[PDB]
């Protein structure tokens with residue numbers, strides 16, 4: 365699984381260890397070993413949310429399975445919680461797009477997961 | 479709805495009110511109040527289009543509904559127009575990918591839109 | 593078709609002509625004209641893969657058709673091979689998400705491909 369966050373928060377406000385925290389919490393949330401989890405944080409972005417430049421985030425989570433109605437509500441609570449606590453972004457200024465990928469459509473190590 | 483534009487145009491060439499303009503235009507185009515619209519502009523990118531580093535853009539529009547054949551033609555005219563007028567990018571060097579997201583697959587404010 | 597690579601490799605490690613190399617190889621692999629291929633390389637990213645900040649990449653390939661089980665395996669071998677040779681990234685620290693786009697969902701030159 366892979367989680368990307370794009371945010372207008374500056375780089376200096378991303379705390380030390382944040383990528384390791386996201387890795388751990390996503391491993392636990394998706395039930396997948398941490399070796400399978402990739403994370404990507406992109407600060408200092410030119411963005412607006414609802415017409416305002418107040419801190420916000422646009423994010424995605426891709427996984428082969430482990431995506432669905434109840435799961436995604438749970439991921440949203442976890443991830444918004446982390447963005448609020450660590451980057452001081454209000455949960456109502458975050459979108460997270462969830463993608464249930466077919467194994468045939470995910471490449472890794474010279475092949476695909478199908 | 480959320481619009482992202484990635485471009486090799488430099489940051490100084492993006493005009494001051496550009497994010498506000500995209501917000502207002504997309505609110506009108508999707509039929510939603512501006513609270514519902516997020517915009518993200520990423521200049522200074524290392525990109526090629528057709529093998530060339532001439533000005534280009536790679537964009538995405540995600541929405542829960544308000545996506546379809548006719549709508550997407552209209553969005554393309556609107557958005558290519560803005561990118562031509564404001565960023566001086568030729569319409570033929572723009573790709574926009576459209577995504578009709580399921581409400582259960584969009585997280586916001588600690589939950590999802592389902 | 594559109595190929596995007598996000599990586600923690602520094603910009604100085606991206607060789608001259610890399611975006612043209614990708615453009616050629618993707619044209620040949622997909623069978624689409626090189627003039628229609630867009631490539632976007634984003635270095636210096638704050639990323640982790642399996643909890644580790646060793647060189648890694650998160651990529652996507654979007655195409656209107658030419659996406660499928662065997663095709664994607666072939667693209668994966670090709671693209672991991674280029675990232676290993678040119679950017680010194682281990683194939684086991686690359687994910688590539690493949691997207692078969694409906695032509696009605698791809699904007700270009702003021703319209704869509706439908």
Ligand SMILES: N#C[C@H](C(=O)Nc1cccc(C(F)(F)F)c1)C(=S)Nc1ccccc1Cl
Nearest residue numbers: 365366399400401427428467472477642684
């Ligand atoms: N992302 C992801 C992983 C994956 O296996 N990543 C992975 C990434 C790095 C290493 C290793 C391994 F070498 F240890 F197996 C695995 C997924 S979702 N694996 C997977 C694919 C299809 C069906 C079921 C699974 Cl667990």
Ligand SMILES: N#C[C@H](C(=O)Nc1cccc(C(F)(F)F)c1)C(=S)Nc1ccccc1Cl
Nearest residue numbers: 414456479480513514515541542581586591
């Ligand atoms: N993106 C987006 C929005 C959304 O509700 N965004 C939003 C984001 C922040 C605040 C507010 C509110 F205060 F206006 F309600 C709304 C979507 S598409 N809402 C929605 C979801 C499912 C079905 C129909 C709609 Cl309008």
